[PDB]
Amino acid sequence: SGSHMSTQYIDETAFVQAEQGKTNLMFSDEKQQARFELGVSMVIYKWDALDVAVENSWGGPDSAEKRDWITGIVVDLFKNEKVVDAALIEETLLYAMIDEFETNVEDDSALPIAVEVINIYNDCFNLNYNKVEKLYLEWQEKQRTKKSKRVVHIEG
Amino acid sequence: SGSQHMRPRFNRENKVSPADAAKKAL
């Protein structure tokens, strides 16, 4: 049931802007801002070039924290700028592979990852979070085998 | 040539875990 959110295409000019009463894309409530950090944490997990780099330890033993740090540095754009575009976030991912991973990502595979972070804001702008919870539930199907095996017993 | 960009290097205080943001968002 259901279907993938993307396969290669998404947009080419995606971006977001704050209201005239604000100085950053940050939310008015810290309870609602939580939906946004969760949402980006899910999109960075779907990038292929970063996933291979932590499995091959191209960043050393610290690459396991550099993995979760890549969403943390992109989230900071929304906390300090009143407008952000997919081109801003993409450079924040491309440089995060070259600053210590010694890996270039000229395949543009970071483009569709940047456009997804932009739409997390659009959903959180009207209290929606259905895709942020969906990716969080679909993320667990391999953590029960790529980190700690478990015999399932689900039956609805 | 061009701007130095906002490109950081490495940190572990701003990082986001798939659960550290879910235990507050869910």
Curated annotation (Swiss-Prot), chain A:
Similarity comment text for this entry: Belongs to the TSR2 family.
Protein purpose = Required for 20S pre-rRNA processing.
Cellular component, GO, one term: nucleus
**Residue intervals passing through the bilayer:** none
Swiss-Prot/TrEMBL GO biological process terms? maturation of LSU-rRNA from tricistronic rRNA transcript (SSU-rRNA, 5.8S rRNA, LSU-rRNA); maturation of SSU-rRNA from tricistronic rRNA transcript (SSU-rRNA, 5.8S rRNA, LSU-rRNA)
Query: Could you tell me the keywords of this UniProt record?
Result: Cytoplasm, Nucleus, rRNA processing
Subunit = Interacts with RPS26A.
- GO molecular function per UniProt: ribosome binding
Q: Is Nucleus among the key words of this record?
A: yes
Subcellular location(s) of the protein: Cytoplasm; Nucleus
Name of the protein in its database record: Pre-rRNA-processing protein TSR2
As a miscellaneous remark, the entry gives: Present with 13400 molecules/cell in log phase SD medium.
Instruction: Write the gene name.
Output: TSR2
Curated annotation (Swiss-Prot), chain B:
Residue ranges, annotated region (Disordered): 7-26
State where the protein is found.
Cytoplasm
Where does the source fall among the domains of life?
Answer: Eukaryota
* Basic and acidic residues composition bias: residue spans: 10-26
Q: Which family does it belong to?
A: Belongs to the eukaryotic ribosomal protein eS26 family.
Q: Any extra remark in the record?
A: Present with 16300 molecules/cell in log phase SD medium. There are 2 genes for eS26 in yeast.
- Describe its function: Component of the ribosome, a large ribonucleoprotein complex responsible for the synthesis of proteins in the cell. The small ribosomal subunit (SSU) binds messenger RNAs (mRNAs) and translates the encoded message by selecting cognate aminoacyl-transfer RNA (tRNA) molecules. The large subunit (LSU) contains the ribosomal catalytic site termed the peptidyl transferase center (PTC), which catalyzes the formation of peptide bonds, thereby polymerizing the amino acids delivered by tRNAs into a polypeptide chain.
> Self-association or partners: how does it assemble?
Component of the small ribosomal subunit (SSU). Mature yeast ribosomes consist of a small (40S) and a large (60S) subunit. The 40S small subunit contains 1 molecule of ribosomal RNA (18S rRNA) and 33 different proteins (encoded by 57 genes). The large 60S subunit contains 3 rRNA molecules (25S, 5.8S and 5S rRNA) and 46 different proteins (encoded by 81 genes). eS26 interacts with eS1 forming part of the mRNA exit tunnel. eS26 interacts with TSR2.
Q: What is this protein called?
A: Small ribosomal subunit protein eS26A
The organism named in the record is Saccharomyces cerevisiae (strain ATCC 204508 / S288c) (Baker's yeast)
The top of its lineage is: Eukaryota, Fungi, Dikarya, Ascomycota, Saccharomycotina
Q: Which gene encodes it?
A: RPS26A
Intact protein stretch covered?
Answer: 100 to 119 of 119
